[PDB]
Amino acid sequence: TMKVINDPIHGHIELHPLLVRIIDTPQFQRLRYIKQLGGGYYVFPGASHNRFEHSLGVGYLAGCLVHALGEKQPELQISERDVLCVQIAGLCHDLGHGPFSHMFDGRFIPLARPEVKWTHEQGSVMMFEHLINSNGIKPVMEQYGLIPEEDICFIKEQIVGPLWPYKGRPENKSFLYEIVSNKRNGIDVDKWDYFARDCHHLGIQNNFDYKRFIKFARVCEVDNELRICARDKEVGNLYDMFHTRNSLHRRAYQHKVGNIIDTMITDAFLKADDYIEITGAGGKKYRISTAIDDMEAYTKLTDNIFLEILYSTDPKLKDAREILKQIEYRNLFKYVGETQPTGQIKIKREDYESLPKEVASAKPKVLLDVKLKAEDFIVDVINMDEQLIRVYCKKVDRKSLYAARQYFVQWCADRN
Amino acid sequence: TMKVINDPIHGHIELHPLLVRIIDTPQFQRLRYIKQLGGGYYVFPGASHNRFEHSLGVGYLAGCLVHALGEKQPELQISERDVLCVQIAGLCHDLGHGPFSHMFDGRFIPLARPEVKWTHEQGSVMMFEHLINSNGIKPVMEQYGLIPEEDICFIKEQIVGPLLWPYKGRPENKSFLYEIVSNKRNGIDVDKWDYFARDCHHLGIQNNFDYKRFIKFARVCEVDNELRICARDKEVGNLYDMFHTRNSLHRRAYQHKVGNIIDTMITDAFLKADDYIEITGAGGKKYRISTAIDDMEAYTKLTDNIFLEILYSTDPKLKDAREILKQIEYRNLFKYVGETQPTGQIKIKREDYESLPKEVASAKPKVLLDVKLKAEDFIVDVINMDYGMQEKNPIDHVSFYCKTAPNRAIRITKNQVSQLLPEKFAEQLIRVYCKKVDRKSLYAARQYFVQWCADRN
Amino acid sequence: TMKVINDPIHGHIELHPLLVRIIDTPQFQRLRYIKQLGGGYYVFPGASHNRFEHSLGVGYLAGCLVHALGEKQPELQISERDVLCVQIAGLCHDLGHGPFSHMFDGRFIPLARPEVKWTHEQGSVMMFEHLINSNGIKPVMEQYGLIPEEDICFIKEQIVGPLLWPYKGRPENKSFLYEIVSNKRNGIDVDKWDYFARDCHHLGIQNNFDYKRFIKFARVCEVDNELRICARDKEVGNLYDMFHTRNSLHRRAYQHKVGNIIDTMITDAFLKADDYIEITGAGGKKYRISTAIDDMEAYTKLTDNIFLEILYSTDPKLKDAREILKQIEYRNLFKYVGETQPTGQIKIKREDYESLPKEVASAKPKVLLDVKLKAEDFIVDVINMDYGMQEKNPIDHVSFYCKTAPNRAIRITKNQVSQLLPEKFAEQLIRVYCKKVDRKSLYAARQYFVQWCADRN
Amino acid sequence: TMKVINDPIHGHIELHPLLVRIIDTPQFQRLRYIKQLGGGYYVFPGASHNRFEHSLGVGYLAGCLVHALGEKQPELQISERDVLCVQIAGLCHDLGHGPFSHMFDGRFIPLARPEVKWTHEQGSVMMFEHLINSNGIKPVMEQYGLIPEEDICFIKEQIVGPLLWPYKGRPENKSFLYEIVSNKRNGIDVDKWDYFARDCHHLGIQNNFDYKRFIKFARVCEVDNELRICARDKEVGNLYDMFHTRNSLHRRAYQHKVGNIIDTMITDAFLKADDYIEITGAGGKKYRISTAIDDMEAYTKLTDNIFLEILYSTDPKLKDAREILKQIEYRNLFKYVGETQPTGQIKIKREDYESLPKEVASAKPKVLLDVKLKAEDFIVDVINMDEQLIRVYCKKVDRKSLYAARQYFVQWCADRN
Numbered sequence A: 001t002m003k004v005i006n007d008p009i010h011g012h013i014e015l016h017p018l019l020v021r022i023i024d025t026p027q028f029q030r031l032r033y034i035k036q037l038g039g040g041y042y043v044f045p046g047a048s049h050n051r052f053e054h055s056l057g058v059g060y061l062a063g064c065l066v067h068a069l070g071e072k073q074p075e076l077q078i079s080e081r082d083v084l085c086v087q088i089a090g091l092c093h094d095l096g097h098g099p100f101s102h103m104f105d106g107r108f109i110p111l112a113r114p115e116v117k118w119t120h121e122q123g124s125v126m127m128f129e130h131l132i133n134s135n136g137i138k139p140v141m142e143q144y145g146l147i148p149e150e151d152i153c154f155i156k157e158q159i160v161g162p163l164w165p166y167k168g169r170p171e172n173k174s175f176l177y178e179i180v181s182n183k184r185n186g187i188d189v190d191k192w193d194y195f196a197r198d199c200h201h202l203g204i205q206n207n208f209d210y211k212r213f214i215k216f217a218r219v220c221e222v223d224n225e226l227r228i229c230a231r232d233k234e235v236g237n238l239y240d241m242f243h244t245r246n247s248l249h250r251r252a253y254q255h256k257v258g259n260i261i262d263t264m265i266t267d268a269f270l271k272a273d274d275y276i277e278i279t280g281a282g283g284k285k286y287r288i289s290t291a292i293d294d295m296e297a298y299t300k301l302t303d304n305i306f307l308e309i310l311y312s313t314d315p316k317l318k319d320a321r322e323i324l325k326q327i328e329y330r331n332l333f334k335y336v337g338e339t340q341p342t343g344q345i346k347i348k349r350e351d352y353e354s355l356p357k358e359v360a361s362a363k364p365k366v367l368l369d370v371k372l373k374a375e376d377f378i379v380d381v382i383n384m385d386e387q388l389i390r391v392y393c394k395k396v397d398r399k400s401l402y403a404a405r406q407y408f409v410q411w412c413a414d415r416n
Numbered sequence B, C: 001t002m003k004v005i006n007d008p009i010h011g012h013i014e015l016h017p018l019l020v021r022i023i024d025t026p027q028f029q030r031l032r033y034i035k036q037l038g039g040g041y042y043v044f045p046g047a048s049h050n051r052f053e054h055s056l057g058v059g060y061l062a063g064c065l066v067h068a069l070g071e072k073q074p075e076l077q078i079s080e081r082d083v084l085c086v087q088i089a090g091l092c093h094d095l096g097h098g099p100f101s102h103m104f105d106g107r108f109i110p111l112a113r114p115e116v117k118w119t120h121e122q123g124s125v126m127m128f129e130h131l132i133n134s135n136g137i138k139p140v141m142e143q144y145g146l147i148p149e150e151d152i153c154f155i156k157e158q159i160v161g162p163l164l165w166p167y168k169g170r171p172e173n174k175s176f177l178y179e180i181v182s183n184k185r186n187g188i189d190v191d192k193w194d195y196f197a198r199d200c201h202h203l204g205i206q207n208n209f210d211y212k213r214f215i216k217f218a219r220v221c222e223v224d225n226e227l228r229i230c231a232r233d234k235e236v237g238n239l240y241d242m243f244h245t246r247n248s249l250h251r252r253a254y255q256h257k258v259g260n261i262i263d264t265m266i267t268d269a270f271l272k273a274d275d276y277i278e279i280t281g282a283g284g285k286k287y288r289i290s291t292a293i294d295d296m297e298a299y300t301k302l303t304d305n306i307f308l309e310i311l312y313s314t315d316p317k318l319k320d321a322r323e324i325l326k327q328i329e330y331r332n333l334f335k336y337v338g339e340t341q342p343t344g345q346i347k348i349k350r351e352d353y354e355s356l357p358k359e360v361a362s363a364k365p366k367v368l369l370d371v372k373l374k375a376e377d378f379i380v381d382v383i384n385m386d387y388g389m390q391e392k393n394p395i396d397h398v399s400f401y402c403k404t405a406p407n408r409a410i411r412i413t414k415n416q417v418s419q420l421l422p423e424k425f426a427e428q429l430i431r432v433y434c435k436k437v438d439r440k441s442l443y444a445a446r447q448y449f450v451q452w453c454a455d456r457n
Numbered sequence D: 001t002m003k004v005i006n007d008p009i010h011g012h013i014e015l016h017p018l019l020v021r022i023i024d025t026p027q028f029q030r031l032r033y034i035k036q037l038g039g040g041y042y043v044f045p046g047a048s049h050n051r052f053e054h055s056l057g058v059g060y061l062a063g064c065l066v067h068a069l070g071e072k073q074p075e076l077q078i079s080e081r082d083v084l085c086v087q088i089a090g091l092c093h094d095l096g097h098g099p100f101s102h103m104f105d106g107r108f109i110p111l112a113r114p115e116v117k118w119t120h121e122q123g124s125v126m127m128f129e130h131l132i133n134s135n136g137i138k139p140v141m142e143q144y145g146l147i148p149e150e151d152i153c154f155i156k157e158q159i160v161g162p163l164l165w166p167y168k169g170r171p172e173n174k175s176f177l178y179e180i181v182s183n184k185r186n187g188i189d190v191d192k193w194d195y196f197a198r199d200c201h202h203l204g205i206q207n208n209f210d211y212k213r214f215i216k217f218a219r220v221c222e223v224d225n226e227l228r229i230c231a232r233d234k235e236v237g238n239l240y241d242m243f244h245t246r247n248s249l250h251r252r253a254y255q256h257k258v259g260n261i262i263d264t265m266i267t268d269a270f271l272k273a274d275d276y277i278e279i280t281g282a283g284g285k286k287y288r289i290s291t292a293i294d295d296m297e298a299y300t301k302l303t304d305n306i307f308l309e310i311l312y313s314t315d316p317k318l319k320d321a322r323e324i325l326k327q328i329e330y331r332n333l334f335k336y337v338g339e340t341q342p343t344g345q346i347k348i349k350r351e352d353y354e355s356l357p358k359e360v361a362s363a364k365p366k367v368l369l370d371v372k373l374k375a376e377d378f379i380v381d382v383i384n385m386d387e388q389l390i391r392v393y394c395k396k397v398d399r400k401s402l403y404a405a406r407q408y409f410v411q412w413c414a415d416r417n
C-alpha cells in the first residue's frame, strides 16, 4: 500500500508502491553517499546533505504540481499514467553524478580525457537505462497499467532533450515536457527544490514561496502550443526569487575556498589515476577516469574514493596522500588574481590544459628573478550561468607570489 | 587572526587562535565522516549531520554560558584562562566515538571482546592525549600563557569522572566548572541543549526547551560548603518539561524499530567480518576491528568507510558480510513479531541477554504449528527507558534559590511541584524479531512469542 | 468567485462565496475587537491576536480535515453540502464570547448574576440565530442547494450538542461529523490545533504537536453500530504528548499569576462600575452590563471599548472604577503572598469560594502582630487544571485500529502504553493576595496564610 | 532589580530600572491601543500589533548596538550615561503618534487645519517633555548619575531634527551618536530593522536581512576629521538585499489598494465627525478633534477608541459618519476610479490637499456627459514613496458615474500634462 516518508523541507510525503519498488535498488541507493554541494562541505559545515532527499523532493514537487494543474482543468484529460511517468522522470533526474556531484563531471573528465564529450545528465540517462534493464521492474510497470515501450522513451526525452523532434507524446500534450526540465525558461521543480534545501541547510533565509506559484498555475493554448504561466501580479515573486538565486550563487557556489578545495580534490584524483583497479562487468578493470563508459563499475564509484586514497599505504600513491594531508592541514595554496573575460568567445572545455602552458610560456616584462615552469600553476574556469578564470600557484613564498602576479597580468593582457 | 564560522542552528561562532590550531588536525578532522545519528539515517532521510558540528556547537554553548556567568557575578574571579580551558574541554568531548557513533560502544564492543567494558569517554580521553602529544601543541599553549601541566589534567578530569574532594585540576573555590560540559550530579549541561537543537532541526521535529531563558536565570551560590550552579525556584516545571522532551525524543527517533534493526544488522555484519581486515598502526603493525581500540594511530583510521568498503569488497572471504549488506540494500529487513507488556516486576540484567532467545525457542505453544524454528531464528533486544539516573529522581539533586534571598539554596521535593508527574522514572522494553519472512514463519513466531509472554510476567 | 485571505500561520485560505458573505457582517466583524488571552496582553507583550483570525483558522482546518477524510474513503457518501455545513459551523464556534474572552464568563457573570447558568457556547448559538434572522441569509443558502430547515438545526447541534440517539439534523451513518469542530466524547478537534499553533507563534514559545501527521493517519471505522474517527494504534504516544503540551501551555501562559490578578482586579472594577453604564438595546431600551445577555442587539455592541471608556470617562459617578484602572495602569498591582499545595485529595466546590476570605481572616496566628487584617483585604483564587475530563482519562474513550484490520476497533488501556504516565489527572490550586502594599501588611498576611494552610491540612 | 520581558522577535530583553519607571506612566502606556499599520488590519488579518512592542524593540536594539560598539572600540571613551541617554531616546521616538500612527498625520490634520505645520516627531518630543515634567522623573534621573539639563536637550535633538556644529548635547567627539536612533546621513538605523522585522513576521512573509551580521561587522572610524559608522567591503550584497527587502515590503503591504481606500474613507469619516465630539482637556476646558493637539493633556486622551465611539454613538448629529462606518463594516467600499501618471513635477504641496478635489471637478472632458458629479464625490490621494503617485476615488457606485468619472480624471491629467 501507500508509504509515508518525512523530510526537513516539505511535510510528510506519500509514495506510490511502484516508486518505492524503484527506490529499493543498489543503483538508486548509490546516491546515499554523494554530497549535494560536493566540495563545499569544507567551508560551510552545514552542507552535509546528500542527493537522495533532493531526488525525493524533486519527485514530490513534480507530482504535486502536475496533480494541482490537472485538478483545476479536468478538460485536458490527464490520466494517472502521465502523473506516474512525470514523477518517475523527476525521481531519477540526477543518477549520473559521480563523486561530489558537479566537480567530477565539470573539472575531472574534461581534463583526464579531453577528446571525450561527457555530461552528468547523459550518464544519468545511461544509469537509468541500466537500472531498468538489470532489476526486472518492467513486469511491475506493466502490472499497474503503464505501457513500458512508449513510457520508457517518454521518460528518456523528459530528462534529456530529443519542427518537433519529440516522439514520446503527441502535440496535444506538449506541456508535460517542460515540468522537470524547461528548455526556454530554466525554472522547474528541481530549481525550487534545491534552492529550498540549500538555503535551509546553509542558514540563508529564503524569499520564494512555491506554494503560491502552484496556487496560481493555469494552462491555456498559445500559438497552438499549450503553456503554463501564472498571473501578472507575481512579478514581485519572480524578482525576489531571482534575487535569491543571484545571492545564493554569489555567496556559496562561487566561494573562493570551496572552489580551490574542489581543485585540490580533482588534482589529487587525477594524480592518483592509473593505480586504482575497480571491478566491472565481466571482471574488466577500469581506472577512475575511464569508468564513465560502463555502469557496473560506475555503480561502485562514490565519494569513498577520496577517503580510500587518504587511508591507503601503498608507495605509489605518495603524492595523492601528501596532497590530501595538505588539505587536511589547511595549508591551502594561494589566490593570485582575477581575470578580465571580455570577448564573446567562450573558452572551450578541452582548451583548459593549454592554459597552464600559455601562462608559463608568457614572458614577463617587469624585473623578475625567479623563473617558474609550467608545472607550478593552476587555472580554473567558472561557468557563471559569464565565464570567470582564477589562478593558483604551487609556491607560497611572497617572492614567488610576486613573480606569479607578473606572469598573470602580462598573460591576461596578452589574451585580450 | 580571529576566525568566524557559520552554523545552521546558532549564528556565527568565534574561535580563539589556539582553537584554530587545535581544530585543523587529522585527529579532530576524523570526526567529519562520522554520522551523528548513525543507524537513524535509513529511516529519517534528513539526519545527515556528523559530529563536527555537534562539537563546534557544544564548544560555543559552553563558552557563552561561562562568559554569561562570569559577567553576572564579577566577584567569582574568573579569568580568560578558565574560559579557554572550559571551551577546549567542551570542544573535544566526543572524540572517542567509533563508526556510527553509538554502534561501536553499544553493540559491537560487548559482542566482540566481552572481556572488557569500554565506553567512549575514556576513548576520547586517550584520543585527546594522543592529539596533544603528537601535534606538538604544548609550545603554543605556553606561548599563550596557559599552563600545560595543570590545565591538561584539568581538561582530562573534565571529560571523565574524578579519576572527600577527589578533583585536583582546580581548587574547591571553582568547583562549579565541573558541571558545564559533562555533569554527573544531574543531567544539566550544554551538550543536551546543543544536540536537542540540532536533532530537532534536522529530523523535522519541533522542540519545546529553549536554553536562552535558563542561561538568563543562572546564578552560583555556596551549597554544603561547595560552589554550584542553581536555578530560580519557579523553573522546576521547566526542568520537568525538558526531561519529558528528552524522553519524547528518545521514544520517537533514537529508538525507532527499523533504526534498531538496521543497527543490529550492521553490528552482525561487522561481527562476522573482522578476521579478514587489517588496519595499519604504529610501526607498521596491523590490528583487527575489535583490537584496534588499544592503538590510537590505528584507531584514527576507523570511520564510516568500513561499511561501504565491506559493501564493495571483492575477496571471497567477505561474502557473508557482503550478502548481509546487500540484503540491507534491497530493504529486506527482519520482520517485527510483537512487543510485550513492559517487562513486569523484574529487570533483565546486562549479562542475561543471550538467554532470552533460548527461552523463546524453548517455549512450547499450545497450538501445533507447521513450522518449527530454532534458537538462532529469534533476535531479542532490550531497551532501557529512563530519565538519566536509572530510576532515581534527577530533580532532587538540583539546588534552587528564591528571589527574596538570592544567596540561599533550597531543595524542592516532588510533592511541592505538582501531582501530574510520573510515578516511576524508568522502565524496560522487550522486542522480538524473526529472521524469516514467510507468512508461516511470522505466524509461528507470533504464536511462540505469545506463549512465552503468557509464561512470563 | 472564490476569495483568498493571507494568514501568517497557514497559507492562502479559500472561501466559498457564502462564507465570505457571512464574514462581512457587523455581528462578525464585532470579533475584531475581542482580545484572545484577555489580560494576558499586559504580561506577554506579544499576545494581541483577536478571535477573527482564530475563527478563520478553525474553519479552514475543519475544511481541510473533512476533505482529507472524504478523499481517503470515497465510500462514505460525503458531499459538498456536508463540507459547507461543517465549514460554516466551525467558522462561528465562539460567537458568544464577551469582553476579554474567558474573563467575562468565568469571573464576572458568576458574581453579578449567580442565579442563572450561562456558558458562552449558548451565547454563540443565540448570536448565530440572530445573524440568520437579521441578515436574511436564508435565500443565498437556498441558492447553493442548502436546505435551511435541516442545515441550520445541524449547524446548531455541532456547537453545543443535543437539543437512543438525540440528534436530528443528520442520520446515524454520518454520526462522525459531530466530532470535527467540538468533540464531547474524548475532546479532539481542530480548535485545539488551531489555537495551539496561533498562541505558540504569537507568544514566543515553541509548540510540540504537528497535526499533519495525525490527519495523515486518520480513518473512519465502525464502532458499536456507529461510525467514529479513529487513529492508528501506533499514535498513542503522540496523543499523550498533545495532552501534556496542552497542560504545559495552560500552566505556563493561561494561568500566570500576574494575568489572573489583573483579570480579577479588572472584574472588580467592572462590578463596581455597574449600574452607571447604559447600552442601547432593542426598541431603544436601556440594558445594564450584567443584564446585557437577554437581548442580543445590546450584546452586539459589548466589546473591550468599554474598558477604555470607563478608564477615560470624566463622569464623577465612576470615580472608584477610574481610580482602580489608573492603579492597574501605574503598575501598583496587588501583591502576591503565596500558594498552597494541591488540596485535590478532596476537591473544593464552586459555591464555597466566597468563604475562603472569611476562613483566612478567622484563622488565629500564634505570633502576635501589631497590624490586624480583616477579611476584605484578602483575594482568593482557585485554579482548576487538568486534562479537561475531571479525573477521566480521555484516551480510554478513543478507538484504535491495527494495520492488518483496517475495519476493527480496539481499545488501549493506560498500562499497555507505558508506566511513565502521570498517576493523577486533575487537581486543584489555591492562591491568596494582599490588597495592601506596606511591608508590615505583607508580613502579617504571610503569617495568616501559613497559619491557615497548616490549619486546613 | 533589573527586569526581563519576553519579545517574540528579539527574545528575552534586559530592562534598566529607569526605563521601567519611564514605561509605567499613562503617556507611554497609552500606546497599547494604536495599530502599527493603521488601516492595514482590515486587509491582512495578521497585523494586530501595536506600537508598544515596536518601541521596546527599538530601545533594546539601540542599547545593544551601542554596547557592542563601545566593547569593540574602547578608545571612544563612552560612559553608561550616554548609553542610557541613547536607550531612553530610542525608546521614546514614537510617542507622539495619533490614531493609526499614519492616518492622522498622513491625511487628517493637513485637511482640517491646513495652515498649521505638524510632524508627529514634534508631538513626540513635546509629549516626552510633558511626561518627564509631570511625573517627578527628575529626581530619579538625578539618582543614577545622569545629568538632567544637558541630557534632556540631547534626547530632544536626537528625536527631532538638529534644530558649523549645530548640535549642543555633546561636542564633536561623540558625533556618531546622533546617527543611531535617527540616521539622516544614509538612512540606516535600528528603527528600520525593528519595524521591518516585526511587519515581515506578522504579515506572513520571510525576510532575509540579518542585523546581527551588521552589528558584528560594523565599527566607527575617523573619516574627514569626524566619526562616522563604517562597515567592511564584503557585505555590499547584504545591504543591497536589505534594500530589496525594503522595496518589496513597501510595494507589497504599505501601498495595498484596499487598505489605502479604507484609510482614506476612515479619514473622511473622522473629518465629518469633527465639530461634534469634545475631548476634555487641561483646566476642565474642551477641545475638538482637529484642535486636540494644542494642549497635549487632552492629546493623551486620543487613541483608537475614537473609531469605536463614532461607530457606536447614538447621537443623531453623527448620522453620516455612522453609515460611512457601517459601509466600512459591510464591505461596500469606495471604487477605484483611476491611477495617475505623475510625470513632470506633480509635487503636491501639503497645503493644497483640499484644493485638488475641487480642481479635478473643474475639468471639462471632451465627451458627452449628461450626469453631473460634484467635487465631494472625487477624492484625491497623495503619497510620497522614496517619487510621487496620485489616485482618485468616487463615492458613488452606480455604473453611470463610473463611466463619467473616468473622463474627468483623464481630462485633468491631460490638463496637468
Ligand SMILES: Nc1nc2c(ncn2[C@@H]2O[C@H](COP(=O)(O)OP(=O)(O)OP(=O)(O)O)[C@@H](O)[C@H]2O)c(=O)[nH]1
Pocket: A042, A043, A044, A045, A257, A330, A332, B003, B004, B005, B006, B023, B024
Ligand atoms: N580552518 C577551518 N575553517 C573552516 C572549517 N570549516 C569551515 N571553515 C571556514 O572556512 C574558511 C576558510 O578557511 P581558510 O582556508 O583558512 O581561509 P581563511 O579563513 O581566509 O584563513 P586564511 O586562508 O589563513 O587567511 C574559514 O574562515 C572558516 O570560517 C574548518 O573545519 N577549519
Ligand SMILES: Nc1nc2c(ncn2[C@@H]2O[C@H](COP(=O)(O)OP(=O)(O)OP(=O)(O)O)[C@@H](O)[C@H]2O)c(=O)[nH]1
Pocket: A003, A004, A005, A006, A020, A023, A024, B042, B043, B044, B045, B258, B331, B333, B335, B336
Ligand atoms: N522503503 C524505504 N523506506 C525508507 C527509506 N528511507 C526512509 N524510510 C522509512 O523507513 C520506513 C521503513 O518501513 P518499511 O520499509 O515499510 O518496513 P516496515 O517498517 O517493516 O513496514 P512494512 O514494509 O509494511 O513491512 C518507511 O516507513 C519509511 O518511511 C527508503 O529509502 N526506502
Ligand SMILES: Nc1nc2c(ncn2[C@@H]2O[C@H](COP(=O)(O)OP(=O)(O)OP(=O)(O)O)[C@@H](O)[C@H]2O)c(=O)[nH]1
Pocket: C042, C043, C044, C045, C258, C331, C336, D003, D004, D005, D006, D020, D023, D024
Ligand atoms: N512593569 C511592567 N511589566 C511588564 C509590562 N509588560 C509586560 N510586563 C511583564 O510583566 C511582569 C510583571 O512583573 P512585575 O511588574 O515586576 O510585578 P510582579 O511580577 O508581581 O513582581 P514585583 O516587581 O515585585 O511587583 C514583568 O516582569 C514584565 O516582564 C509593562 O508594560 N510594565
Ligand SMILES: Nc1nc2c(ncn2[C@@H]2O[C@H](COP(=O)(O)OP(=O)(O)OP(=O)(O)O)[C@@H](O)[C@H]2O)c(=O)[nH]1
Pocket: C003, C004, C005, C006, C020, C023, C024, D042, D043, D044, D045, D258, D331, D333
Ligand atoms: N471579504 C473580506 N476580505 C478581507 C477581510 N479581511 C481582510 N480581507 C482581505 O481584503 C481583500 C479585499 O477584498 P475586497 O473588499 O472584496 O476588495 P476587492 O478584492 O478589490 O473586491 P472584489 O474584487 O469584489 O473581491 C480580500 O481579498 C481579503 O484577502 C474580510 O473580513 N472580509
Ligand SMILES: Nc1ncnc2c1ncn2[C@H]1C[C@H](O)[C@@H](COP(=O)(O)OP(=O)(O)OP(=O)(O)O)O1
Pocket: A004, A005, A006, B043, B044, B045, B205, B252, B258, C213, C238, C403
Ligand atoms: N512520531 C513521529 N513524528 C515524526 N516523524 C515520525 C514519527 N514516527 C515516524 N516518523 C517518520 C519516520 C519515517 O521518516 C516516516 C515513517 O514513520 P512511521 O510512521 O513510523 O513508519 P513505519 O515504516 O515505521 O510504519 P508502518 O508499519 O506503519 O509502515 O515518518
Ligand SMILES: Nc1ncnc2c1ncn2[C@H]1C[C@H](O)[C@@H](COP(=O)(O)OP(=O)(O)OP(=O)(O)O)O1
Pocket: B213, B403, C043, C044, C045, C205, C252, C258, D004, D005, D006, D007
Ligand atoms: N515559561 C515562560 N517561558 C518564556 N517566557 C516566559 C515564561 N513565563 C513568563 N515569561 C515571560 C513573561 C514576561 O515577558 C517575562 C517575565 O516573566 P516571569 O519570569 O514569569 O516573571 P514574573 O512576573 O513571574 O516574576 P518576577 O516579577 O519575579 O520577575 O517572561
Ligand SMILES: Nc1ccn([C@H]2C[C@H](O)[C@@H](COP(=O)(O)OP(=O)(O)OP(=O)(O)O)O2)c(=O)n1
Pocket: B036, B037, B038, B094, B101, B102, B191, B192, B195, B199, B254, B255, B388
Ligand atoms: N539510544 C540512543 C541514545 C542517544 N543517541 C544519540 C543521539 C544524540 O545525537 C547523541 C547524543 O550524544 P551524547 O552521548 O554526547 O549526549 P548525551 O549526554 O545526552 O548521551 P547520554 O545521555 O546517553 O550519555 O546520542 C542514539 O543514537 N541512540
Ligand SMILES: Nc1ccn([C@H]2C[C@H](O)[C@@H](COP(=O)(O)OP(=O)(O)OP(=O)(O)O)O2)c(=O)n1
Pocket: C036, C037, C093, C094, C101, C102, C191, C195, C254, C255
Ligand atoms: N486564561 C485563559 C486563556 C486562554 N484561554 C482560551 C485559549 C484557548 O483556545 C481556550 C481554551 O480551550 P478549551 O478546549 O478549554 O475550550 P475553548 O475555549 O477553546 O472553546 P471555544 O472555542 O468556544 O473558546 O480558551 C482560556 O481558556 N483561558
Ligand SMILES: [Fe+3]
Pocket: A054, A093, A094, A190, A194
Ligand atoms: Fe537536481
Ligand SMILES: [Fe+3]
Pocket: B054, B058, B093, B094, B191, B195
Ligand atoms: Fe555530545
Ligand SMILES: [Fe+3]
Pocket: C054, C058, C093, C094, C191, C195
Ligand atoms: Fe475557539
Ligand SMILES: [Fe+3]
Pocket: D054, D058, D093, D094, D191, D195
Ligand atoms: Fe519607529
Ligand SMILES: [Mg+2]
Pocket: none
Ligand atoms: Mg514500514
Ligand SMILES: [Mg+2]
Pocket: none
Ligand atoms: Mg515583579
